[PDB]
Design a binder for this molecule. Structure first.
Ligand SMILES: [Zn+2]
Ligand SMILES: [Zn+2]
Ligand SMILES: [Zn+2]
Ligand SMILES: [Zn+2]
Ligand SMILES: [Zn+2]
Lengths: 532, 216, 531
C-alpha cells in the first residue's frame, strides 16, 4: 500500500529498448522502474512470467457511431469500440468529429466537437478517447475566408483540445478541391495542427465506377478494380506537392499502394515532414478474399469467406474498404515500409457494419434497397472492416514472431509511441515513463513456455472481439499471442479473456500540439504567408 | 474547324497550315455522352482531317477536371487522335495568384512566382497517370519544368506512349529578364528589356508566357 | 544511504523519450528511475537544474597509438583518448586491433588483439574501451581462405569478445580485392560478426594521385581533388553488391559522399541490412578550409589557412580520408542523419601534431628529404582529433541550431545505436535500471540567465584534454558542454575538471549484435555449405 500495482518478472519493451525490469503503478500513473520491487509495497502484484510488457496501443483511426451519421449508421458506439480496443491491448482510441454545416461563426467547429463529446459522455468508456476533426466544407475565396477558419481552429483547440484535421480527396460530399486543401493547410500550419489526408483521386474513381457499372461489373470484387494503386499514388503525389508549396507537415492515412509508399519515401529522404499510416489488413490480406475461386495470412484458413461459402455472392462485402485490399504481391511492400521508416504509425481504420443481420441501417446489406434504386452494387456497399481489437495481436504474431517486423521495439514505435507523439498525446500516453505516463500497459503471454494457459486463445473469433459487430474479417485464423492483462490508467480492465467493467473509467482526451508538426520553414519560392 | 478554314481562305498564305482542336466543354456523365463525342471527332476528322485535340489543366474557362479528360481520352484513343495536354495545376495557380495579389505582389515578375516548376511537375504526373489508366498516347506541350521532364522520362523508359514538346525560350531565357537588373543567351545583349529600360515597369510583360520562363 | 548517486531536477533523454524524472545510481549501474527520489537516500546528490541528461556517448571509430603502428605513430595513447572522450561526454570508445601477419594458425587474430589489450592494461583509462579487428591479409584460394578464417574469428570472439571486422577498399597495403572481401564476408556472416568497410576505389585514388603529382599539384588541397565523391559512391555501390550476393549485413564507416548516401538509402529502402556511420566534420566543414545554422562559419576558426596565409602546409590540419568535401555537400549529411541513412555518428579520431615538426607523430612527417618525401599531400598523415568535440558539436549545431529534428535523434545516433550495432547493448547506450552501466552526461541548462564560469564559450585545445597540440575546431563558439560526465557511477569530469582518482576504465568484451543477424535473402539458389 504505497503502490496500487506492481508488475514483476516481465520484460519491458519501448520504442528504443528491451530489458527485464519491474514497474510500480499508483494514482493512475507509472511511478517507478527498478530491477526488483518488494511485493509488500503494492496492493496488487502481477507476475508477468517472463513475458513482454508493452505500453498500451494507441489507435488513431477509429470510426464510431456519431450524431451526424457521416458514414451512415455504424454498429459500434464509443462504449463498444473502447471495450473492443481494450480486449486487444489498445488503451487509447481517436475517432472523428464531423464538421456540422448548420452551425456558423467562430464557434462552428468547436460546436461540431461538442456534439460527439456530449453524446459519448453518457456511455461507459473502457479507455480514453480523443477526436480528429473532419473538414469537407471550405469557404471560398481563399483570402477573404482565412480570418474565420483560423479563428475556428483556435476555438476547437482552445475549447476541446482538437489539434488534427482530416480531409478527403475522394468520396462524393467529402472530396475537396486542391484550392480548398491549400486554404486548410494555410490555417493548420499557422495553428500547428496535424493535417491528415485520405489520398485517392476522386474523379478517377467516379469515372471508373461508372465505366464498370455500364458493363454490369458490379460485384464486390470490382471495388478494387475501380481504384487500382496508381490512383492512390497520383493523389498522394499531388498532396505532397501541395504540402511542399504550403510548407505544411502532412500525414497520409491508410496507405496501401506501392506508388504512394514510393513518393512518400522520396519526400522523407528529402527531409520534408511527410508522415504515413498503414493498416494490418494491407499487410495481411489480398483481394482474392473478395471473391471465390507466407508473408501474410493463409486465406484458406479464414472462416465464413467466399472460399468457405461460394453460394453467398455478397459475402465479399465483409472485406470491402477504402482504399481497397490490394492484389497479391503488394503486401510485402507494406511490411518493408513499416520497417524502413515509411510508415510512422499503424491504425486499424475500424469501421463496423453487420453482415448477419440484413434489416438495419447499420448493415452491409444496406446496399440492397430496391426502392432507393440500390441493388447490391459495390458502389452502395458501406466501406469498412472491424479491426480495433485485432490490430496489436496481429502485429505481435505476424509482425514480430513471424519475422516480418525487425523487432518488438519497432512494433511499440509504430503502434504506441509514434501515434502519441504525432497526435499530441505525448508524453502522457505512448510510453512507460515514471511520474509522467498514464499507466496504460499490456502484459502478453510468455512465448517460449511449455506451460498451458486455458485463457489464451488459439484462434480469432467474433466473441473474442468484445464488440457490437456480428463478424470479424480474421475469423478462424491462428493467433500466437494475446493480451493477458490490459491495464488502463492503473486499473486492470482486461484479464485472461474477461473485461472488468467496474474498472472502466475512460474519458475524453484533450490533446496538445504535436512537436512533429512544427513546420520545416522551407519554401519553393520567395512567397511567405502574411503572418510569418 | 469550318470557322477558321473559311476565315483564312481569304488571306494570302505563304505556307501550308493545319489545325488542332481545342476542347474545354465536355458533356457529363461520361457513359451517356460517349457516342456523340466519338461521333463528333469522326466528323472533324472526316470533314477536315483534324486528328489532334488540345486540352488545358489550367486557365479559368479552359481548365477541365480529370473526369472530363478521361472522357476525352476514351474518345481520342478510339479514334487514333493525337491527345495534347497543357499540364499545370490550375487550382494551385489560382490560389497562389490570389495570395500574391493580397500582398500587392502584382508586377510581371510575380507571374513566375505564382506558378513554380513543381506545379507543372504535379500536373504532368497526374496526366501521365490518366493516360496510363486509359492506355492513351499523350503529348505534353511547352514543357519547361525539370520535375515534369523527369516524370516524362520515367514513362518513356517504361515504354509508355508519352511525348513532349518544348520551346526555345525555355532553353535560352531565364526569369531575370522579367525584372530590372550560361547555355542560353547573354541577357544583357537583348535590347529594350528591363535591363536597358529600368524606368518602364511594365516592360517585363514582353516575356510573360505560360508556363513561365524559369529561374536561372 | 542506499545509493551512491542521485541526479535530481533533470530531463532524461533517450533514443525515443524526453521527460523530467530522477535517477538513482549504485554499484556502477543505473538502479532506479522515479519522479522524485529522497536526497537522503544517496551519498551524493547532483542538481541538474533543468538540464538534459543523456546516456554517455559511444564513439566506435577512434584511432590510438598501437604496437604495430599501422597508421605510423599517433600522439594519443588509450589514456589520452579516453581522457579526451570523457571531457567531451563520450564514455565508451572502440579502437582498432591490427592483424599481425607474423602470427599464424587458429590463434593468429586473438594474438593480434592480445598485443593491444596488454599494452593498454598498463595505462590509466578514464572510460571503457573495446576493439575492432582490422583485416588486410586474406589467404587464397577462397574455399581454404574462408574456412581457416572462421576458426580464427571464433578464437578472437571467444578469447577477447571481438565481434567486428574492418576492411579497406583503398590505401596501399590495406586495400583488398573483391574476391578477398567475399571470403571475409563468408566468415563474418557465419560468425554473426559486424562487417565494416572503408569504401573508396583504391585504383582510382592511386591513378589520380599520380596524375596530379605529374602536374606538380601536390599541395594539401589536392587531396580532395584526388578522390571526388563519385569514387566513394562507386566503392560503396560495389560493397553493397558484394554484401547482397553474400547476404551479409554491412556497415560503411565515415560516409561523406552524396552518391554513397544515395545507394545506401536505396538498399535500406529495399530492407537490406546496410548500416552507415558519418562524422561531424562531414556536416560542419567544407574543403575551402584546406587552402586560401547548417555549417561552422569557417572564418571563425583560428590558426587556419585564412588566419595564416603564409603557412602553406597548415591545410594538413584538415586532411583526412575520405576528404572534407566541397561546399554544398554538408546539408546532405544532416539530412541523412535525420532520415535514417546514418545509423551512427563517430569521430574518426586520429591525432598528429602540427606545432612540433620533428617527431614520428607529426604532420610534418610529410617532409622527409632523405626518404624522398617533400611535403606532398600523399605523404601527409591522414586524420583529425575529434573524440572530445563529437557530442558537443552535435548538441549545438545539430539540436540547438535545428539541423537535427530532436534530442532523441541525437541520443539514437551518438549513444544507443553504436551500442546496438557493436554488441555493447544493453550494458551500454541507454538509461535502464538494473541493466545499464551508469554512463551518463549532464549538460548545462539552455534557457537559463544564470552564469556558469566553468561553461566554455569557445573550443580551445586545452579544453580537449588530449595529447595533440591542435584541434580543427579551435576558436569556434560552442553553445553547450558536458557539465558532469559520469562513468560507471563515478564523476570523472566536473565543470572543466578531470577527476583522475575516479578513472577506472577497462577493456570491454562485446557480444554479437542483434542487428547483424542475416536477412536470409539470396540473389540465386546458391547457399553456403553450413546453411
Ligand atoms: Zn479514409
Ligand atoms: Zn477511416
Ligand atoms: Zn498552353
Ligand atoms: Zn577509413
Ligand atoms: Zn578510421
Amino acid at each position: 500500500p504505497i503502490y496500487d500495482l506492481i508488475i514483476k518478472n516481465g520484460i519491458i519493451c519501448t520504442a528504443s529498448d528491451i530489458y527485464a525490469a519491474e514497474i510500480a503503478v499508483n494514482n493512475g500513473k507509472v511511478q517507478l522502474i527498478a530491477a526488483s520491487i518488494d511485493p509488500s509495497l503494492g496492493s496488487e502484484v502481477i507476475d508477468a512470467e517472463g513475458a513482454f510488457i508493452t505500453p498500451g496501443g494507441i489507435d488513431a483511426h477509429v470510426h464510431v457511431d456519431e450524431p451526424l451519421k457521416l458514414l451512415g449508421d455504424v454498429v459500434d458506439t464509443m462504449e463498444h469500440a473502447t471495450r473492443s480496443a481494450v480486449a486487444g491491448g489498445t488503451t487509447t482510441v481517436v475517432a472523428f468529429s464531423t464538421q456540422d454545416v448548420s452551425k456558423k461563426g467562430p464557434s462552428a467547429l468547436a460546436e461540431s466537437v461538442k456534439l460527439d463529446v456530449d453524446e459519448y459522455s453518457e456511455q461507459t468508456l473502457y479507455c480514453d478517447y480523443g477526436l480528429h476533426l473532419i473538414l469537407f466544407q471550405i469557404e471560398k475565396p481563399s483570402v477573404e475566408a482565412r480570418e474565420l477558419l483560423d479563428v475556428q481552429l483556435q476555438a476547437a483547440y482552445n475549447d476541446y483540445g482538437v489539434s488534427s484535421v482530416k480531409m478527403f480527396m475522394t468520396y462524393p460530399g467529402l472530396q475537396i478541391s486542391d484550392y480548398d486543401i491549400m486554404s486548410a493547410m494555410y490555417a493548420t500550419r499557422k495553428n500547428g495542427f496535424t493535417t491528415m489526408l485520405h489520398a485517392e483521386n476522386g474523379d478517377m474513381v467516379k469515372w471508373m465506377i461508372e465505366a464498370l457499372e455500364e458493363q454490369g461489373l458490379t460485384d464486390a470484387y470490382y471495388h478494387g478494380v475501380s481504384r487500382p494503386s496508381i490512383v492512390e499514388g497520383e493523389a498522394t503525389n499531388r498532396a505532397i506537392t501541395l504540402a511542399t508549396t504550403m510548407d505544411t507537415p502532412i500525414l497520409f492515412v491508410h496507405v496501401s499502394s506501392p506508388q504512394a509508399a514510393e513518393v512518400i519515401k522520396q519526400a522523407q529522404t528529402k527531409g520534408l515532414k511527410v508522415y504515413a499510416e498503414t493498416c494490418p489488413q494491407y499487410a495481411l490480406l489480398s483481394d482474392a478474399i473478395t471473391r471465390c475461386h507466407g508473408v501474410g495470412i493463409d486465406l484458406s484458413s479464414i472462416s465464413e469467406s467466399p472460399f468457405t461459402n461460394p453460394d453467398d455472392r455478397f459475402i465479399g462485402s465483409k472485406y470491402i474498404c477504402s482504399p481497397p485490399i490490394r492484389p497479391e504481391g503488394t503486401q510485402k511492400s507494406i511490411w518493408k515500409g513499416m520497417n524502413n521508416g515509411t510508415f510512422t504509425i499503424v491504425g486499424s481504420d475500424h469501421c463496423s457494419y453487420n453482415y448477419y443481420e440484413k434489416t438495419s441501417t447499420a448493415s452491409k446489406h444496406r446496399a440492397f434497397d430496391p426502392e432507393n434504386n440500390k441493388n447490391g452494387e459495390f458502389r452502395y456497399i458501406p466501406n469498412g472492416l472491424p479491426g480495433v481489437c485485432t490490430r496489436m495481436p496481429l502485429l505481435y504474431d505476424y509482425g514480430y514472431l513471424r519475422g516480418n517486423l525487425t523487432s518488438m521495439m519497432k512494433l511499440v514505435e509504430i503502434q504506441c509511441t509514434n501515434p502519441a507523439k504525432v497526435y499530441g498525446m505525448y508524453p502522457q500516453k505512448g510510453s512507460i515513463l515514471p511520474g509522467v505516463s498514464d499507466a496504460d500497459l499490456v502484459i502478453w503471454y510468455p512465448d517460449d513456455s511449455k506451460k498451458e494457459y486455458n485463457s489464451k486463445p488459439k484462434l480469432i473469433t467474433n466473441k473474442l472481439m468484445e464488440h457490437n459487430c456480428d463478424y470479424t474479417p480474421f475469423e478462424g485464423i491462428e493467433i500466437k499471442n494475446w493480451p493477458r492483462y490490459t491495464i488502463v490508467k492503473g486499473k486492470i480492465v482486461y484479464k485472461e479473456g474477461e473485461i472488468l467493467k467496474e474498472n472502466a473509467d475512460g474519458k475524453y482526451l484533450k490533446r496538445g500540439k504535436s512537436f512533429m508538426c512544427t513546420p520545416k520553414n522551407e519554401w519553393v519560392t520567395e512567397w511567405r504567408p502574411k503572418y510569418e
